[PDB]
Structure 1
Amino acid sequence: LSPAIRRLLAEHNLDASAIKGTGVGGRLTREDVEKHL
């Protein structure tokens, strides 16, 4: 992740609730929201 990942959701205004975080344990990574962008 990066220090800009947090502001990345507040920049494009997107609900992570609609995105699936298949991270290592059900976490939200960047390869998940990106596909949505």
Structure 2
Amino acid sequence: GSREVAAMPAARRLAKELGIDASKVKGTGPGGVITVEDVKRWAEETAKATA
């Protein structure tokens, strides 16, 4: 399924609890699933940005 974006539960759950568009989170997990590390790393990438 290349014409569909996957989003595992862990990343999905946190994504919904964090308020981030998992789609915006280029998932690289087996089957195009946005991995937890993907959402977490990005979520922090935003907060990491100071200026």
TM-score range, shorter chain: 0.5 to 0.7
- Name which one, 1 or 2, has greater alpha-carbon Rg: 2
Superposition RMSD in Å: 1.7
| Code of the aligned partner of 1:15 | D
Structure-2-length-normalised TM-score: 0.51
| Code of the aligned partner of 1:25 | G
Alignment of 1:15-34 (within 5 A): 15-34=21-40
Structure 2 alignment gaps of length 5 or more: 1-8, 44-51
> Any idea what SS the aligned residue of 1:18 has?
coil
Q: Bigger relative contact order, structure 1 or 2, given CA contacts below 8 A and separation 6+?
A: 2
Shift of 1:16: 0.8
Structure 1 alignment gaps of length 5 or more: none
Q: Percent identity of the aligned residues?
A: 52
> 2:36, 2:25 → 1: CA distance?
11
Structure-1-length-normalised TM-score: 0.63
